[PDB]
Design a protein around this nucleic acid. Sequence first.
RNA 1: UUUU
Lengths: 67, 40, 39, 38, 517, 240, 92, 484, 484
Amino acid sequence: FAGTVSALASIGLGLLGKSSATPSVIKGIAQQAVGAVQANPGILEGAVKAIGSVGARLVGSIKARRA
Amino acid sequence: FAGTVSALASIGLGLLGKSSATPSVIKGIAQQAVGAVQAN
Amino acid sequence: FAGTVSALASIGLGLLGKSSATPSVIKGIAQQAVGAVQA
Amino acid sequence: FAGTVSALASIGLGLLGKSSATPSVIKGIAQQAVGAVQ
Amino acid sequence: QATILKPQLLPGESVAPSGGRGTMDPPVHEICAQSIDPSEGAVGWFYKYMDPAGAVESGKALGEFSKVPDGLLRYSVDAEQRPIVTIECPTVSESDLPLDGKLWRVSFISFPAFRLNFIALANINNEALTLETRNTFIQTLNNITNWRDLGTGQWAQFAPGWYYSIYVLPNTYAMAEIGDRTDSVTQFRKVYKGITFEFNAPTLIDQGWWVGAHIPVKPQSETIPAAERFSAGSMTVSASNAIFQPSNTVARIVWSITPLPVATVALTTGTGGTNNTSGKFFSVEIDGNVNSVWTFTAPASILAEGEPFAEEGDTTSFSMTTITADTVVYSVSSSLTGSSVIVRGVTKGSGVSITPVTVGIDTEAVNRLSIEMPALTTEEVTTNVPKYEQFLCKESGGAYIVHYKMNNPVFEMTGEENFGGFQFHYPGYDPENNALGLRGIVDTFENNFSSAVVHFWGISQSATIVCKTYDGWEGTTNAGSTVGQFAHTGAEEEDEVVQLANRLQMELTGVYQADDN
Amino acid sequence: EQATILKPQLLPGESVAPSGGRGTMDPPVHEICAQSIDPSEGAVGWFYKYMDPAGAVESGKALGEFSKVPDGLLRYSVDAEQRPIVTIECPTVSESDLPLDGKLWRVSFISFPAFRLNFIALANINNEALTLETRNTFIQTLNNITNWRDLGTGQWAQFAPGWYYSIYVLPNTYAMAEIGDRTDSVTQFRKVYKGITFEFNAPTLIDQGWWVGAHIPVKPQSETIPAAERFSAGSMTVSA
Amino acid sequence: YPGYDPENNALGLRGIVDTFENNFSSAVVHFWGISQSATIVCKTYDGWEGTTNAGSTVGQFAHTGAEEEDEVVQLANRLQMELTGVYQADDN
Amino acid sequence: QSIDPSEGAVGWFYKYMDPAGAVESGKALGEFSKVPDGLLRYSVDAEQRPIVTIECPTVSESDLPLDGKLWRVSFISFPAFRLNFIALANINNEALTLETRNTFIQTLNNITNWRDLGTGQWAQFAPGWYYSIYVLPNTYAMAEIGDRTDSVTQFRKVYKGITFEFNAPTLIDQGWWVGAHIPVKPQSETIPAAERFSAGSMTVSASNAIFQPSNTVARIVWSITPLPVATVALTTGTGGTNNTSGKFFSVEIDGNVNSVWTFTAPASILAEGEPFAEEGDTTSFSMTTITADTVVYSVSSSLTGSSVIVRGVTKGSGVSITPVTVGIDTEAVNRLSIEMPALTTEEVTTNVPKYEQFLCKESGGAYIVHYKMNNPVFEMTGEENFGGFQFHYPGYDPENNALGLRGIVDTFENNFSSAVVHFWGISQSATIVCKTYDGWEGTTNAGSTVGQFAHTGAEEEDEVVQLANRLQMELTGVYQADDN
Amino acid sequence: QSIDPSEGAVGWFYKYMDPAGAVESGKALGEFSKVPDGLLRYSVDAEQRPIVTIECPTVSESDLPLDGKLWRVSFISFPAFRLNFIALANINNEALTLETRNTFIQTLNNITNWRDLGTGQWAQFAPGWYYSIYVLPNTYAMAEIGDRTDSVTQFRKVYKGITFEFNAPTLIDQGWWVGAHIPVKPQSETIPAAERFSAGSMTVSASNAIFQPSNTVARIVWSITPLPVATVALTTGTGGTNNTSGKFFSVEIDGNVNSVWTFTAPASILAEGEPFAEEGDTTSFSMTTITADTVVYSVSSSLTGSSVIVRGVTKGSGVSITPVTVGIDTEAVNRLSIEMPALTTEEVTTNVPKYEQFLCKESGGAYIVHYKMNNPVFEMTGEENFGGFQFHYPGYDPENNALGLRGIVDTFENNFSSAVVHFWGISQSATIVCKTYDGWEGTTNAGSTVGQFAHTGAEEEDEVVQLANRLQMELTGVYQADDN
RNA sequence: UUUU
Ligand SMILES: [Ca+2]
């Protein structure tokens, strides 16, 4: 995910946004941002695909448009 | 008591004394001390 | 006293947690940990 | 005083910011930053 | 959100009609939040320091991101060099089949160094590195003489199935180390450094996997003495093989000499095939057959094996008696009558043959930097590092690496202190094989940042690696600095963030996939 | 009013791989919304600089990347100010004593919008009228300078009796070597503005002195020094 | 120069080397009656922008060009011309 | 927010604070050896607690003679990677005079294959003086590229706690001591790497061999820096040859004057502008005169034309250096110019106000807690300052320094204060037990064993660390042993 | 009650800010030389306030002439332990040719016994240029090896800040300046330690003598790198000698070509690969020639068959060096490669943005205030980086650098801006009073006097410091004197 | 016609 990193860090910074930056809180916020603790759908992963099927699929489809 | 530079301290040190002590806040005072401002 | 230092810290660390972490608070704590009992 | 130029530079610039910026309109400004119509 | 503007005159300052300063701290467009207000530079930096390559194409980059937001420097210049190199197999391994299922190994060492980007060495054959294999490698990077004449990113054989190249950073490297025109800045910090090792492979044979891991390294200034009348030196003859021509016939030794001045080596007696440096010290790139003989006028007096060999006006002639398909014997000859010839046994693609020379030349003292070569082992890294990641090149379209303030908890200002001739030590490695004089890489090493390596393994000759690097350095310019004209106020301290970053980083593995780029 | 624009790193419709695309991001444009326009500080800043390159800075009008002429001409560009400050002094005849009620000098400056070079000094100790000969002797000189960098130190240089000149360069640009071994410069360039304040460093009272200034354009029409091989003709000068 | 023999000119590539802003006005500022003991501090401000290529030790400091503000530029132009380029060293 | 810190960060706390008591008070929680500065992405934290039994140089371990005699013994603790600390003792409770002092120093810097004293065992160095070194097992174990080799890219002592328990029969449970911390940074004085030849020095210390006719015999340890370890064996006479594990050339021998030791030169040698041996000569070293006080020696070789060599060395104090040149090659390896922490009970008071001192009877010894004194943060101490430190000190004349890679070679914590503890009125019938809770945290680069233990650097526990060095600050790094 | 820093912090804050107004404004209170970072168990803080009236080189501090002539004077303050700053000068109003500056530097890189220069006395390195070294007394006062021999382990500049008052009569205030802080850091290029023969070199800087025959009589500063100091004295000719105090050989002397001074070798010396003279042999020095820009010097050795020396030296230019080789032993000492803070008005103004120039008349002088400019936090320079200040700069080639322990011998305060103040077109007849309020915090290892007022480190007061640090990165550090 |  292009910049999954900054995106990750982005969220954490986000929280820091409101959260009075107490090294104590920051900790939590950090821990959180990674997804280690206190997380909700504020999470995401591998959206891309292994060519195996990416390839295989478009091979399956070319003519199988009957449906 | 000629120090300008010095005044530019006690001014911010002045604030700091009753300032929330946030280092973020510190930035605030530290710029105020220089006598900075929010333009427009 | 079974590691006076140790306890002497427990006290300082004890106060700490069960109290805001004001970078300035701390001092008074570290200072209370031994000498000046902070108010 | 120091920045005498940047003075008009402001009057000028500033004025522009409000006026209907136009070569003509403009010139007039650059002229007001100093001159008087007699 | 809002903009800030500091005055030229500090509350009360009473300047004349032309006094004051000449600068005007570019305005503060710090963004706002319920608890903090980092400036776009502070912010951009955060992301850049975190996900350099991404945060940019991520759109999250901005402001003075190449400056560190710890309001330390009163003034500082800064920037980012995004050199993109395409590493690819060295041997044009000729195959007859329609499918030369060949594979090669390759690894990169990243050094948060001022002028240096990273190092890289591959093995045409996917064979791993041997101790002595490794060693030669090492001792080579220490013996590299006029190293600057290598930044071209050009490949270089040091071992049999092994080559290696070094990549500078376009500009900082573009800042010379001579007393005449260009000299570095008073100091700096690696504000953040990342590299993506794009797995450019034919989506046909995308085989391969790679392991990345950050390793911190601090240099040790094991300094060279400042000589006067005479100076100690080392004559180097690293025998090698003609990438194309018959081993048992032709050799390709590199012949340099530690403190002796660069002097044009023209092949006179032999067949031909030379390529001399331009560096300050004398070195040569030459391939040829036995009978062949190169020549040059010795810039200064030269001793050896006790007895004097040459004098300023003398003419040294280097040749090779024997050329086994793997060993090489050579001869060095002085005009100066009464001198005797020098001969020595080497082994192309192997260690160098040293020749404790002495050069009648005043010798500026300069430190050599004893730096532990980071785990280069196929599987050492895998061990001494838990925060290492690794996937197949196929999956992770390459490797993403993000360095970080590793050594110091805070951002010191690596300055001239640790600057000098990189000389890598390692376990099992013998230094006796280390060349004398000021040779090897030469650069100011950001002692704060995390050094780091990444080895690729089991890929295809066809697969090449596009290394998109994003180096962010910031430092203070002094004089003659061709950059001082870019320095402004140093980033403001917004530790609020900074810390967070530090946590993330720590909390994180400086390695990721070129798909998370 | 304030505003901050952000040019996406991509183009509308571009599908971009992670790894690749554009490597550089665009520094955010900050505009000062006005009832008629909304330039970016890199404009105003410039504007002002271009207009009063010193008082604009002393004043507090030098905003952003002001060293960039706002005329959407370049896609990418390098901007930078240079504020060298040399204190051109009277030259030296000798510790030949000096009475206040006595000696003084004439010194002139010629400033050219030359990339590296800053300005050319010239002064006459005993205070002289530029005689024709004096002039030529001068010009001929500037011209016949061999390793012009040799005096880039901004050091005085005699030529005519009692006549000295000197060259001051843009310390950072001069710093960028030409045709050197592996050294060279930029592609194009263009002064974005340039002013000079010859502060009158004079005793409060011996404030004696008068100066004149004027802008006069000058364009370099080039003449060539032909290349050659076996031997390249030239000449050896020797001034006294 | 008006009244100068190009005979005194040196042959080869000598003289001050450099690129000339084929755009800006050059100036001259003569001073007379300056007590030997008096000197002149020449505080300059040379701004400039170019396009780096290779080996440039500046390419890093490079990035996006300035946007077109002729809306403003114009003023500046017709403004300069409006006045001299010469002022008092107490108006900077 | 409660200011909740990892239970392991707490461990570190007390450990740092009270490295000994923390263990005893069970307050030793989690991987307390990692510094909670949230710095390292990963790291290995270790803590060795090596215990040393310090006996009075002459006194037995077996039988305890209740002499009612005393002895001054001091220890210098350095935040060195493997080096635990150094200890020196006077069998007469005597004061450390200059020469004695300087000799002491002198020795430490000319300790050739320092690894030869890895064994806690003493080593006379002056008329009534002995000294020895205490390595940190596990680290000292880290053989510097041998057969078994692992390595660390950098480290930083997470704390050091030594407690010199006053092990003395209550009978003559007497004497006192003074402890104090003195921070010292080292400077890298370099030992130029050379090729065909390498300059060096042939040292030869001399001093009576406990249990041998004072005037007759003499135990001496002569070495030759660049000269590769040579196996010396007595050639002719009264026995007494202890060789070195070392990489260079050094050997400790003792015997009649006429006694002779000899070994083959593993490389060409030069002395006094002259040649001495070929990489195959049979070098012969013996003594000319032996005085309970002085001693004359002389070495020669099978080198045809090889002149002889002769110099004197007043027994017990200093070495007879011999400017030498060896036929082998040197490495860049540099020494570490290190200020020597106030060795006199005098200065310690006159210099360290946050020093303490109690009687060994009440204060069951002395317990010191080292702390980051150098810089306000836990910077990483890597390669940058590693090398054979040679201590310098006022009075000490560099002249006396060897020339090769000598001294205790190791890394120095660019942060932690070094500390020294002087015991004075101790009774020979007493032994100082040394509990040493010292724990560092570093990073691995190459190795086969340590790696598997590296995890993540302790999270940034800013709040704790904060107060941590806050306390250590306002606190004497010295303490009553019994307070551990 | 947000925070309550103790006076020692405030007083500090204000000082590390306006070290003049601090005091002046009575704002400096408490033990302010200690940085309230709370990093030390104990520490000795101190503030040296030297007030040196840097008068023009060729001027009478007495009957100053209301000349109306000029002179350049650049000050390059370095955050060094016992080194305030260097003063560059130029009676003739002339720019700094590469020749010139290159000559300058080399002079400072080859200053035999820099101590001999502590007087800050003026020294002519170039026809119209002089330099001199002003020191922070009290520290310098503590004799290096000393008599009571006080030795400081590590220290750290707590606040430099010095004002360069523009002492000038309204008659002649013609003056203008510009300061700017440029950080600098020393790279320990080590001088090796050798045994019987250690190499070195013989320097000879020639120049004319004040009020002396600019072609009939010339003064040189002959010295020898590792050579033990020895006393010289004219033997035959026009008098004129000034011996050294240092431990190495150097001397200043005036005289004609007929004049000959001599001294006795303190030890063997080889020259041009030839035994020039041994212990005894009495060496002589004279001038085959003497002009206004050149001088042929020649040293005659008492040794038999000892070929003598002959050398051409353009007085006012560099130092003509003759490699040497003395039979003395040498301790390896550290030379410190150090960039030289932009020496040119422009060089400074274009590369440094936070500079600040002024007309002396309006700005009653100059007031620079350094600050921890490297380490974001106050680390602790110690042994860490101490040695022989040997500088380089763009242009300068070390081809003319001394092989011996030369230059300014001190410890550079690792983290802290070193600044530069250039005063251009100052009235001959005017001087620069330089009151520096420099302060440092250090630790004592051995001494008899300093370790008395050694107390506890400052109480860790972040916010305070925090702010202090903000204001710094924030400011110029260069202000109108009227602001101290 | 739509999955990825
Ligand atoms: Ca450091």
